[PDB]
Design a protein around this ligand. Structure first.
Ligand SMILES: N[C@@H](CCC[C@@H]([NH3+])C(=O)O)C(=O)O
Ligand SMILES: N[C@H](CCC(=O)O)C(=O)O
Length: 258
């Protein structure tokens, strides 16, 4: 009958300007209002934010706009002695302190097929890219940078698409930076270097050159932003896991505690 909370980012991490506070619980939360009341967030410099639930075990908190660089954030999840709904009580209290780094926003514009990385507003890299072809397009919107892998296999069956089917794949890639839980990454794609900057050929990922992918891996960090614009796709879902910023502020602020 006890629930354990887990908070991210990790204690002492430096994260980008898009990183939300995330609190996950190992059990479904019956009284979201009680959970929100138990979570205290302090920021310096102080900024307004609000809670929004991504599913039955995970709540997020962010400001209306991306964090200012240098912001220090303290999170206190005080669920000991708190009835989180239906007599499920917090197993413990949990705290985290984190800081915001430089503002790094990389914009991939399907009109030019270039992914341009800006650091505190200045262009530092312009990479030709090949995004999702028209039958398997990359969604537009704001994506938060998640984990980074020097090598991994992306397998479409993770996402309910059989590897044997027309949009299926089981693909080894180097220098892969995850930007959605729906399976978009920026990664090395030596097989699409001809097409990069000209033609979209992927199932949704942002293919770039091996040197550009390794540069991205080396220089972009969790919470940095990639914004995709002008593709033939829809918009990344606000509840993706890394698509929080696609939910308009008025809806986020209003919340869904019920
Ligand atoms: N394999 C393609 C893109 C990955 C597919 C992914 N975005 C998805 O959500 O289906 C490529 O990298 O060339
Ligand atoms: N099957 C891989 C693509 C995986 C994604 O794309 C290719 O044709 O190069």
């Amino acid at each position: 009958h006890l629930t354990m909370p887990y908070v991210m980012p990790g204690d002492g991490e430096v994260v980008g300007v898009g990183e939300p506070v995330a609190i996950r619980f190992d059990e479904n939360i019956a009284d979201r209002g009680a959970a929100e009341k138990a979570i205290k967030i302090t920021t310096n410099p102080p900024v307004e934010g609000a809670f929004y639930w991504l599913n039955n075990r995970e709540v997020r908190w962010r400001p209306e706009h991306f964090w200012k660089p240098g912001t220090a954030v303290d999170v206190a999840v005080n669920t000991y002695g708190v009835d989180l709904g239906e007599g499920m009580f917090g197993e413990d209290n949990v705290q985290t302190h984190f800081t915001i780094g430089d503002e790094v926003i990389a914009t991939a514009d399907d009109n030019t097929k270039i992914l341009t990385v800006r650091v505190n507003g200045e262009v530092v890299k312009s990479m030709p890219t090949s995004m999702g072809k028209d039958s398997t397009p990359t969604a537009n919107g704001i994506y938060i940078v998640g984990s980074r892998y020097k090598h991994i296999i992306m397998d479409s069956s993770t996402y309910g698409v059989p590897v044997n089917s027309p949009n299926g794949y089981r693909t080894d890639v180097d220098w892969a930076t995850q930007i959605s839980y729906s399976g978009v990454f920026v990664h090395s794609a030596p097989w699409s270097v001809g097409a990069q900057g000209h033609t979209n050929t992927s199932h949704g990922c942002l293919n770039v050159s091996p040197s550009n992918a390794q540069w991205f891996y080396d220089h972009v960090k969790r919470g940095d932003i990639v914004e995709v614009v002008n593709t033939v796709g829809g918009t990344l879902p606000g509840i993706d896991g890394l698509g929080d910023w696609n939910i308009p502020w008025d809806q986020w602020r209003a919340g869904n505690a019920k």
